[PDB]
Amino acid sequence: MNPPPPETSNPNKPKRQTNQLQYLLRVVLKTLWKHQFAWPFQQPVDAVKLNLPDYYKIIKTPMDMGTIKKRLENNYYWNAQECIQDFNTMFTNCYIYNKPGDDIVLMAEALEKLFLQKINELPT
Ligand SMILES: Cc1cc(C)cc(Oc2nccc(-c3c(-c4ccc(I)cc4)ncn3[C@H]3CCN(CCN)C3)n2)c1
């Protein structure tokens, strides 16, 4: 009973390439993807396989880096702020579902720390 993944392509939306969107894919997404803690965040949470039947009762705005990767590749974002919001939704989803002190929360916290470090280098 997993939900469908978030929408990642819409051929009717307008499309543009910007230095910030390219940076978010080539640098931010790439660096986070290759991080040693990235694996639980590289795809939608599979609540069925993981036996988490309350995940999508608690998390009603799912987000993950596999979805963000597709959105960047498909020029789904017009503004860099949309992509940054998706990353933030992704981390907060982990913090909402879990509790302070859980090992999974430590992984999310490390990735978010790296994410913010790369966002500070965002080009004008
Ligand atoms: C058994 C286990 C442990 C660990 C450390 C990872 C794991 O792999 C996995 N994969 C995908 C998602 C999760 C997950 C998440 C989560 C939520 C939103 C997002 I965006 C990304 C991850 N929150 C908790 N969990 C697991 C971890 C243990 N927890 C059970 C006891 N609390 C369920 N974990 C499996």
From Swiss-Prot:
Signal peptide as annotated in the record: none
Domain Bromo: 16-122
Site (Acetylated histone binding): N98
Post-translational modification: Phosphorylation by CK2 disrupt the intramolecular binding between the bromo domain 2 and the NPS region and promotes binding between the NPS and the BID regions, leading to activate the protein and promote binding to acetylated histones. In absence of phosphorylation, BRD4 does not localize to p53/TP53 target gene promoters, phosphorylation promoting recruitment to p53/TP53 target promoters.
Domain of life: Eukaryota
Covalent cross-link (Glycyl lysine isopeptide (Lys-Gly) (interchain with G-Cter in SUMO2)), residues: K57
Location in or out of the cell: Nucleus; Chromosome
Family: Belongs to the BET family.
Noted disease: Cornelia de Lange syndrome 6: A form of Cornelia de Lange syndrome, a clinically heterogeneous developmental disorder associated with malformations affecting multiple systems. It is characterized by facial dysmorphisms, abnormal hands and feet, growth delay, cognitive retardation, hirsutism, gastroesophageal dysfunction and cardiac, ophthalmologic and genitourinary anomalies. CDLS6 inheritance is autosomal dominant. A chromosomal aberration involving BRD4 is found in a rare, aggressive, and lethal carcinoma arising in midline organs of young people. Translocation t(15;19)(q14;p13) with NUTM1 which produces a BRD4-NUTM1 fusion protein.
Task performed by this protein: Chromatin reader protein that recognizes and binds acetylated histones and plays a key role in transmission of epigenetic memory across cell divisions and transcription regulation. Remains associated with acetylated chromatin throughout the entire cell cycle and provides epigenetic memory for postmitotic G1 gene transcription by preserving acetylated chromatin status and maintaining high-order chromatin structure. During interphase, plays a key role in regulating the transcription of signal-inducible genes by associating with the P-TEFb complex and recruiting it to promoters.
Misc: JQ1, a thieno-triazolo-1,4-diazepine derivative, and I-BET, a benzodiazepine derivative, have been tested on tumors with success. Treatment with GSK1210151A (I-BET151, a I-BET derivative) has strong effets on mixed lineage leukemia and promotes myeloid differentiation and leukemia stem-cell depletion.
Record protein name field: Bromodomain-containing protein 4
Annotated source species: Homo sapiens
